[PDB]
DNA sequence: AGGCGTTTTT
DNA sequence: TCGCAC
């Protein structure tokens, strides 16, 4: 039986998906669907550029409708096409039921009648200049509204969004409106009392007083950035904020009670009135970001009284063409008792030591600092030792060069109780003396720096609680037989991306070093180009996880008997990466020499035009092969082989012609397979022996199937149809003649 | 005439 | 195969 609601797919949650199918009008979908189950339609980014009054009649329970991209402004149009949307008077009110309309990026320019259930509205990006009474008559459950994007250089209009005084109090239960990018210059007036959210930014409202926010005591959230630019920090086309602006008078928000987060960034802000904070006892987050505070956070009392302020951003705080030798924190940073992090980067200043920072030191919650792109090239990491909380520190993309004068296969930090991003950093040589007072460390990035060195185990000798090293994109000479021996709880080492000593030719290199780190979970040795004069074997009782893709194990494993054993020392590997390894062959003498514990093997990306199934057999724990990016012409050469544990395979992007009868039926436990991009032109039961109903996932996109009238695939497919993603879409024809590169439901093959 | 295209946010 | 110790 066909899916439900071609040519959409059907989603979980009543969700049915037209999204991206270039349609020129709204489906109706067939009288035996169950258009009843619908509580979602979902229609981004076809060519609908007329709605009518039956098109959602049918769909009687429906709640969210997505409608946008539909007809973009030409401003917005990715080559400037005029786009204009009609919209029928009943579209809408037929669907009574109606709570989420998304209706942003086509060219309306008024609001179409709406029914009374609508909840969301969202108008952005739109041609809609002006809100009065009747635009939004009778929504009276209506609590968002975004209307974001309708006047400013993607999408132009030649003058200011007009809000009539009042336009919206017909909106009792108002609590989100956002009118971002209307080139607004000032309030609109009696807005509604219930609003909690109000997002103003990136308009021309460059003077603010108590009356542009009257009544509004509910705020929760005020966002008025962006409206007095910087034009010198701007990626977009940008007009300076003028001179003597922006006037934001002492009292603006002296009435909002309840506000918790108020955005002032790229503000054109070179000093802060204390005036401003006054009363504000509930604000948790404040964005001064963009602004010209570089001078004012040395001095400021501004920040005395906001006890419960937890997140404060002052980035891209810097003095036009110039960084500071010095900066001191003001005194008064320090009685953010509440602070958990703290955004200083890109304020550009050359030293970091006990000074800078000492208001912060004692501030109990303060967990996550940024100080990246700073240019620091001095810096006492020592002054972190005592700071009672820090989890994390940021001090990535700067100039510090020393001490002062798949997670499966690597996990991340995010869970580690102290992390310091070191990396994009200047350091050529690691000494030990920078990190002395940073033992609690559990987590180190030093990526990406310059690290030239035949590391030997007297680098990192006071990080003792270290877990985690990331030395990727570095130049760490492998040779010495004890680096990292000096990190007792080292899990995970990413040494990836240090090719140029594994390219100097003739000089070899030696990886008997982790053996000696007895701790070693986690290994990355990727993308080092590795080829000749290594270490014969690599060898860990501890190992699960190594990484070796984007090496040249080809010209290993082609030199005579070397290399053969190369991984088998790795007694307790589970995970292996061999991927873009240049392997034009594999011996299964080769593979029977890989860890007897293996569970996961990719070979992506390699040029193997042959595979000895039966050789799975010496790997008897595998559950998932990955062979995407390869060169097979067919599945043949024998059969899966019989009590293979494999639960996933990925055979996609090669050039697959045929598969054999019978190919997976002894893989009683295959449960995910893709066939995506192969050369298949039928899809056949028989090659699952009877078990094609076991699957899962069965992916057969884009593969050039041959659409005859009574083709057999078409069957099967439905048969099969909960496990094959995309199947109303992309699942396409190759031939004959005009049905190529169309779906195979474009036409009725039964 | 319409088409284009996976498009966050500045 | 990189200051070892013919
Ligand atoms: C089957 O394989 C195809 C092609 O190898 C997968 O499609 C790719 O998926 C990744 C994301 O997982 C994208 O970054 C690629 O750019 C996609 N490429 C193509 C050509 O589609 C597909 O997702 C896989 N199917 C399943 C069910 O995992
Ligand atoms: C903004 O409004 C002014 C008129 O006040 C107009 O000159 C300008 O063109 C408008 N900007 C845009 C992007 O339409
Ligand atoms: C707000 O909506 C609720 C529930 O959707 C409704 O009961 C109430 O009458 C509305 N309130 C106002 C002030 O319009
Ligand atoms: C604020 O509310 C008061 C009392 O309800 C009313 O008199 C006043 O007009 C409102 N202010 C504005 C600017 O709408
Ligand atoms: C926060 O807003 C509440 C209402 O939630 C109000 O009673 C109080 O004045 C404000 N300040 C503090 C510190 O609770
Ligand atoms: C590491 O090399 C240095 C010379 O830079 C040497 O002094 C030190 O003893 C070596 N450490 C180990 C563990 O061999
Ligand atoms: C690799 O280094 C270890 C420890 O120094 C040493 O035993 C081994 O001989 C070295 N390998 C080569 C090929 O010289
Ligand atoms: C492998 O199968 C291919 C494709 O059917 C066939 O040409 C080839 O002879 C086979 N080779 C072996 C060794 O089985
Ligand atoms: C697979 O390898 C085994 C063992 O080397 C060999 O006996 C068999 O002939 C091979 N199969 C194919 C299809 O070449
Ligand atoms: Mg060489």
Not at 49 to 62: G, I, P, V
Not at 65 to 78: Q, R, Y
Not at 79 to 99: D, G, K, R, S, Y
Request: glycine share 6%; with cysteine; proline share 6%.
């Amino acid at each position: 039986t066909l899916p439900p609601f071609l040519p959409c797919e059907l989603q979980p949650h009543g969700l049915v998906n037209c999204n991206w199918l270039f349609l020129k009008s709204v489906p109706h979908f067939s009288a035996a669907a169950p258009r009843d189950n619908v509580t979602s339609l979902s229609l981004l980014s076809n060519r609908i550029h007329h709605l009518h009054d039956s098109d959602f009649a049918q769909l009687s329970n429906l709640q969210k409708l997505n409608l946008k991209w539909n007809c973009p402004p030409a401003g917005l149009s990715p080559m400037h096409f005029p786009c204009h949307m009609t919209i029928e008077p009943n579209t809408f009110l037929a669907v009574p039921t109606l709570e989420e309309l998304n209706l942003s990026y086509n060219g309306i320019t008024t609001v179409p009648a709406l029914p009374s259930s609508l909840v969301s509205l969202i108008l952005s990006r739109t041609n809609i200049l002006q809100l009065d009474p009747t635009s939004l008559t009778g929504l009276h459950a209506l609590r968002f509204l975004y209307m974001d994007g309708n006047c400013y250089y993607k999408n132009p209009c030649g003058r200011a969004l007009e809000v009539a005084p009042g336009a919206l109090l017909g909106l009792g239960n108002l609590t989100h409106l956002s009118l971002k990018y209307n080139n607004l210059t000032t309030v609109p007036r009696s807005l509604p009392p219930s609003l909690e959210y109000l997002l103003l930014s990136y308009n021309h409202i460059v003077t603010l007083a108590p009356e542009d926010l009257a009544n509004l005591t509910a705020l929760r959230v005020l966002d008025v950035g962006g409206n007095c630019r910087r034009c010198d920090h701007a990626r977009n086309p940008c007009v300076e904020c003028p001179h003597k602006f922006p006037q934001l008078h002492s009292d603006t928000f002296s009435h909002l009670s309840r506000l918790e987060g108020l955005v002032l960034k790229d503000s054109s802000l070179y000093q802060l009135n204390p005036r401003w904070f006054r009363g504000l006892g509930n604000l948790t987050v404040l964005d001064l970001s963009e602004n010209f505070l570089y001078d004012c956070i040395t001095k400021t009392k501004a920040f005395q009284g906001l006890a419960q302020l937890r997140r404060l951003n002052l980035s891209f705080n810097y003095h036009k063409k110039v960084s500071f030798a010095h900066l001191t924190l003001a005194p008064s940073f320090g009685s953010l008792l509440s602070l958990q992090e703290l955004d200083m980067h890109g304020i550009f200043f050359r030293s970091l030591s006990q000074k800078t920072l000492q208001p912060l030191a004692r501030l109990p919650m303060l967990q996550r600092l940024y100080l990246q792109m700073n240019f620091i090239n001095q810096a006492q990491l020592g002054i972190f030792k005592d700071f009672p909380g820090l989890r994390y520190i940021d001090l990535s993309d700067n100039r510090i060069s020393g001490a002062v004068e798949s997670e499966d296969f690597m996990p991340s930090c995010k869970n580690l109780s102290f992390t310091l991003d070191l990396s994009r950093n200047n350091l050529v040589t690691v000494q030990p003396e920078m990190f002395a007072q940073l033992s609690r460390l559990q987590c180190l990035r030093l990526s990406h720096n310059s690290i030239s060195q035949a590391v030997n185990g007297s680098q990192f000798v006071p990080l003792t609680s270290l877990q985690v090293l990331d030395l990727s994109h570095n130049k760490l000479d492998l040779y010495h037989g004890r680096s990292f021996t000096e990190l007792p709880r080292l899990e995970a080492l990413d040494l990836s991306y240090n090719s140029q000593p594994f390219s100097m030719r003739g000089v070899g290199h030696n990886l008997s070093f982790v053996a000696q780190l007895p701790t070693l979970r986690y290994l990355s040795l990727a993308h080092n180009g590795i080829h000749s004069r290594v270490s014969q074997q690599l060898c860990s009782t501890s190992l699960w996880a190594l990484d070796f893709s984007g090496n040249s194990l080809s010209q290993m494993w082609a030199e005579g008997d070397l290399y053969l054993r190369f991984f088998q020392g790795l007694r307790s590997l589970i995970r292996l990466d061999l991927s873009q390894n240049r392997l034009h062959t594999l011996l299964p003498c080769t593979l029977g020499n890989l860890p007897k514990s293996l569970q996961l093997l990719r070979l992506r990306n390699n040029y193997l035009a042959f595979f000895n199934w039966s050789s799975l057999t010496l790997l008897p724990n595998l559950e998932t092969l990955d062979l995407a990016g390869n060169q097979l012409k067919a599945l043949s050469n024998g059969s899966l082989p019989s009590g293979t544990q494999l639960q996933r395979l990925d055979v996609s992007r090669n050039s697959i012609i045929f598969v054999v009868p019978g190919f997976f039926a002894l893989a009683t436990r295959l449960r995910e397979l893709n066939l995506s991009a192969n050369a298949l032109r039928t899809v056949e039961p028989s090659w699952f022996g009877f078990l094609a109903g076991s699957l899962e996932v069965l992916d057969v996109s884009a593969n050039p199937l041959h659409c005859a009238c009574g083709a057999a695939f078409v069957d099967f497919l439905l048969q099969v149809q909960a496990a094959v993603p995309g199947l109303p879409s992309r699942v396409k024809c190759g031939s004959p003649g005009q049905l190529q590169g169309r779906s195979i439901f474009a036409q009725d093959l039964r």
